[model samples]
Target: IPRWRGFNLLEAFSIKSTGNFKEEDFLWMAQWDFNFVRIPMCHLLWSDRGNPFIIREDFFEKIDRVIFWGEKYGIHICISLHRAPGYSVNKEVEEKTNLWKDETAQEAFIHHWSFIARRYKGISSTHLSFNLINEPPFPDPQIMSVEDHNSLIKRTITEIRKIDPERLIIIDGLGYGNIPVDDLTIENTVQSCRGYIPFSVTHYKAEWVDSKDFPVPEWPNGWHFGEYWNREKLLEHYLTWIKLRQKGIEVFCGEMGAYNKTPHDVVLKWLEDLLEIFKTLNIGFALWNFRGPFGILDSERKDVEYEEWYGHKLDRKMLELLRKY
Candidate 1:
């Protein structure tokens, strides 16, 4: 997959969020020698809560502009549904229907994929790809079994191929992108994994995770929840993805990075090891975001001596660290 390295743009992350993708994001990525951008969008942004089948054309047009920017800047665009018809990692609001069990949600999911495939039918796979869904929850037979997840994936692929047979498809691993779907053997599919291992380092002091009780992180030997983490543990964590790759499955790190509250030096030390591991394993990655707390620009990190850049604070050290890989 060309070892596609880049960042995730959150312009359409939530249903209520509204904004067109800025051309400068793509331009800057290309200038920085990165070649991929994953847009993690909320499905509700383009579809009504009452009827998901009825898409908002205006929102779709905004996505079209992103594709244009990607093409113009020689960047690959990956469209991902962070909040799908019946699921999301952000549990602020629970979905009314379960995607794994509800036929209506399944139908809406298929419809959305089919519509997107048809809309961008002729786009080259080199320039565009589709990530079926964001991080799926831990597997539970009563909720979403491995079989249920694989079946839904196959169903969505079938509908998408009907319109765009050559479109590339990426599937995020289950267990919140930590565990590979060992049973899935689909062709032309890339399995994406996460790089945020030893959460105490990546998500330290992050409010969403309620990490207040977690100890401050230390590189190469950190403690989180009752477990000890070190470089060896980090390698052990990613070996699962390597095992999948040994079985001829393509693997990529779809989301990664430390939150701003994590000590800057600790973040870089942990990241250096993780990035080195990815480089050795030939696995590419996209950080969680490009402009927010987990990114290079305007991260609001107190420890960083930020550089002025076009009205934003640029984390030059982080940028250089990413470039090294």
Candidate 2:
């Protein structure tokens, strides 16, 4: 709830790699005056398909190293499960069960949280927090209703609090982190939302969403899926998140940024509008990644005349734009 601004460190992002976090990332973020780092992790990396409840302690030690770096660099660390027991936005692979409908999956999810909460039981809330999950899909009665999401969240909270009552917990909004959950009223909790409005601009030419067919984007006004998208429309979309802040619920933008394929000028223009709105609302944000396609470092953007930063291509303009806010 400290207007935590930073980037999502993706070292543990996928199941394919070893979960080794880079110390340079923490050192550089601190040097740049950014104070937060969110680790979006895949549970599949630490747990096995045959036995989901059995966690790999070695993988957990890798997370411990990340925490050590955060404390050393004066950065707040947020640990989040990007792929949970039964769900994930990534469609490269399918989960064995539906978290909303399967009791076994729900238990596994709670077990994971309990283990994490107990492991870091004495960590200061100011320096560390737990983000329940990454982006959740829109609620559907047959799949995952609003009530189902709420129940699972509450159950996880209950399990975690049993070990560490004062640990800060953040819950991402439903609808792929675009809509706030009106019924969530737990203490020491924050609701997180996304900033990628008018997806055509944010995901332009991105293969994952098949956005190659999207119209070329413009800043002030553009066409996305036959609808007019502009600064005003973006503001209108965030009105609900602002209202959540008005109601005393702390809100944050968890993941947002235009992919490298988006035009650089348009990306900056859209980001300026988004950042200005966040400034006024006092909502913090974390770009989708810290060193990949959606970040300021090593973005590999074709349009950027990059600066050489210790072997990485730094987007100086994008870095300056982010620093401005």
Candidate 3:
């Protein structure tokens, strides 16, 4: 529950490259005094439709190596299921596997989580935590009803606790980790949300997102929806879940950052304001990535000078701004 500022490592995005969990990346975070990592994992790596009951030991070994690296570097690792057996945030879910409607997929999802709990039974919360799933996607009418989504999360949590009762658990908000849902709110667990406020400012020209045609964005941008984009507005959105602190529940920002295509000065301006809000609120956050696009080092922000830090092009100005907080 400490202020954990780090990155979302994506080694599990591609099963073929799971072994590429770079130790140097851990060293970089440790070097900068970062305390945590949110690893977005794919269930396909551990269990899949073809072999739902069986967990491949060889695949589990990849995660073990990353956790081992994290332990050595003094960083807590949060294992997040980004691409679960029947769920995913941005990507298409596995065909014929609907988590809300299919009982088999539900069982498979819980079993996968249970396997993880049993496998790392002895690890302390200081060294490891479980992020139930990346970003629940049910509000979208095409997905599932809100009731079903909440029930699935509750069931998964109950199942995980059966094996590891005291392990710290985190649940991201619905709607791409932005909108808060009361159905999944439980005691002794942290709720998470995203940081891409004023999507036009953060994802300005980003190609991956569905809506890319954005206006020229500035910090405190006055745009559509009769809303002004600024630190205050940003805080207002986060307050939905951040207010959970009143009930002794912790809130965290699981992912947040501006893409590299945006102007560097504008991005820094926005980040400074956001970081100020986060620090003042005592909220923890992990930037979207470590190496590319949304990270500090190797992000290729219009370079003034490239200093070598742990074998990567270090963005000194960016790091200075971040470390200031």
Candidate 4:
């Protein structure tokens, strides 16, 4: 498949106690020329804790409805299993990743994927793909080895392939896809990247992430949170990979975006720097969310007239940024 740069369908995978879906989301994303919607499914949202997943059949239907949209619309969708019970890369936040050492969490995860694979096999659309997990946190001690992580990738891919032999598959190379693909044993897999936005804007309301509020200018998470690197700078560092090759090489910027609170002018400008790089590289992308604090559509403060791509109101500045870039 040809690589195209874009955003992840964030809020869909994040999950809420309240369940809802509206038609506008489907129509709006098509307008943006977004080719992929990486929906992150929660293991906790689907599993019965210690048991082998007493799945709410309705969840499968909810997902089927989305896949149906992809079949009808011009978008390609990737189903990401954000293994919620054990490891989430967002350790800095309230959520925790307790998976690496927990056997129960492990079993729940395997069963969750197996269930999804079995039930969803009929949707033979190549427009759909599967992301194995979000980010997994490795506490320094029970830390994950490359072998362990790679093995997980193998097993997950094998399971998914068992039922959906034709579905496109995307797997995380551990933290933010920091692992390079050393093997391409599986033909249907691709690598996922989630840390690009942090290299761009020092968004106004971004939390834990450093910003103009915390420092005049900052860098990616290591140097500072929400700190941004200009387009030229970001490209300067990222293009290093042009010479390197890894397993089943395809790039999906699975997560990226500025905070809702940042100034439109600044956010847009920095965003242009980021999007232009992706566009030029032909890297496929999915924004970080569907709805939430970081959402572009479900504007907490905007009016009804605002754009909601599946309940998301397009942050005009962000929209403009993409247009300009």
Candidate 5:
């Protein structure tokens, strides 16, 4: 049987590079049948400022322990760089990553990945794969022109390959995993997952959402209490989703969790519905953050204590619905 029963790769507990979220906290997820974790690290945590580069041994020790547990269970890891400082998910980082404008920032990015590649090379298939950039751009605000985004991702991958060539390397779509791969050639094992959610429900409670904020966008806009295009005929839309990925593209739903929506039971049912699609299509995914708004195991947010995670609650009750899928 396939090891994955709809797994999540990022649940930053004992968050190595970042703070909060702990390694020990992950044991609970294992109980929930989670089979993967994608640790998104900051360049600063893995490296020092100016002069020489340094690897935080303490951090590695922590992650090393997590890998051990993964062996005990069957969860794989997906190590990713969330913030390459000068480069990031939004346009601001692109401005910061102007390698042409700032040599130091570029150096930081390169050195960070180099250190990470060499650091975890010995680990086994205890992970779905490794991704170099969480959301990278060439500092273009008008959404990448497809060609430029491809070039930027290609360059990032090329740099990563120089360090580690054996492991499976995952990549994302252009403009923060938003653009479609039309005229680009990603390397073998180089697949892109959809970032953010399809709004409707998952993006609920979002602050800067299109319409919720200012510009008052449309369709894929707005974020409120209970917002999902109604739990009706999602199967076709999901199957259509799979077809989009068939074009030499591997699918990954990087984030998918409900905000304060239609009661906890309803949220779980929604996830159950979505997971059925993912399992049917063999898609890879990681819930946004391990613990926050939209987190299956979230912490505290505005006005709500979260019956469970940012989601609501978990247990056999949570697992029962998911099992139906």
Candidate 6:
């Protein structure tokens, strides 16, 4: 498959974007020679409380609209469950059942994906894919090894392949996609990881994340919070998946980018480093968004001399860096 290069389409992934399917966004990526979009969506957007297992026909209509745009724009779409039945990584969030501990939750999760598999029965694996969840965070107390993780993945893939054998299925690694999953042995699958390394450089001054109050950021920030935040550390972490790639497993940085709160210049420097690594590894990746926070246009980056690009405040330098990679 071609290396994916585009932003995560956030329109239909939010609470306010229920019926707002923006086609121009996909077209915009196409204009930049990008071919893939990671469309992470909340499960609540398509289901009712009384019968959450049943896929709403109306909601499927809108999702089908996205697929139509994918065909028209020639952009591959990666559908992800940002919020699953019983587990989520978001702050102040609660689910009906903990997917890790509850059998019903796991059953419901597979049932939802089975519906997804049935919905897009004939779509090409290249044009459409699935991300099981945004980030399955198995924290300190309940941490599992790569072997245990692979068992869960194998079961899910076995269930999915029963309906669609050729679909491209993706799963994030443990530690919120920051770590690598090197043991999963499913076919037509890809292991996705994050690129928000060195929270100081990526999420500096970002109020939401825990690393908001870090000291002044630097590119080669070393030995902070029990880990090194330099280029070497970055490479070491990503290279763990190289063994998996050698085993014929496709790997990609499913989500990676710096928040606008980071210094624009520092953001550019860190991105240059990461993108170089990405290109060298020949891995496809998707940014967090296209219009807000970690985006090229309408990013609201601090002290940036923005110019208008296709009618939005554009970060020309950042766009140049993205295009170069």
Residue-pair clashes per prediction, in order, are 0, 0, 0, 32, 20, 0
lDDT of 5 at 317: 45
Q: For model 1, name the residue pairs that clash.
A: none
Give lDDT for model 6. Answer: 0.78
Whose lDDT is greatest here? 1
- lDDT of model 5 at position 82: 67
Q: List where candidate 6 sits over 4 angstroms from the true fold.
A: 48-51, 139-149, 222-226
Write the residue-wise lDDT of candidate 3 on 19-91 in tens digits.
Answer: 5688888887888888888888877666665756567867878888888988899998999988777667545
What is the Å distance of residue 293 in model 6 from its true position?
A: 1.3
Q: Each model's TM-score, in the order given?
A: 0.97, 0.97, 0.92, 0.80, 0.71, 0.93
Higher-scoring candidate on lDDT, 1 or 4: 1
The lDDT for every candidate, in the order shown, is: 0.88, 0.87, 0.79, 0.58, 0.53, 0.78
lDDT of 5 by residue, 1-325 (tens): 1433333434332224244345444666676676666666555554454432465666666556656666666767666766564554432223334432355765566676666667777665336367766765433645444555556556656776777666567666554564445544454554555523445454444454453532221232222324434334445544554565556655566545555432455455557666766677676556554445555444333333435543444343444554444
lDDT of 2 at 180: 89
Model 5 vs. true fold: TM:
0.71
**What's model 3's TM-score?**
0.92
lDDT of 2 by residue, 1-325 (tens): 3578899998888878578888998888788888898998899898876667878767899999999898889889999988878988877668878888789989999999999998999999988899988888889888899999999999999999989989999999998898989988788888999988777788888888867578887777766677878888877777778777656678889888998887898999999999988887788989887899999999988899999999988998888888888
Output the better candidate (2/6) by TM-score: 2
lDDT of 1 by residue, 1-325 (tens): 4798999998888866784788888888789999999998888887877776777767788899999888889889999988888888876557888898889999999988888898899999999999999998899998899989999999999899989888889999999998988987778788999988777888888888878788878887877566888888878878878788666778999999999888899999999999998898888899988888999999999999999989889999999999999
**Residue-pair clashes, model 2:** 0
What residue pairs clash in candidate 2, if any at all? none
Off by over 4 Å in 3: 49-51, 92-94, 138-142, 222-227, 302-304
Better of 1 and 2 by lDDT: 1
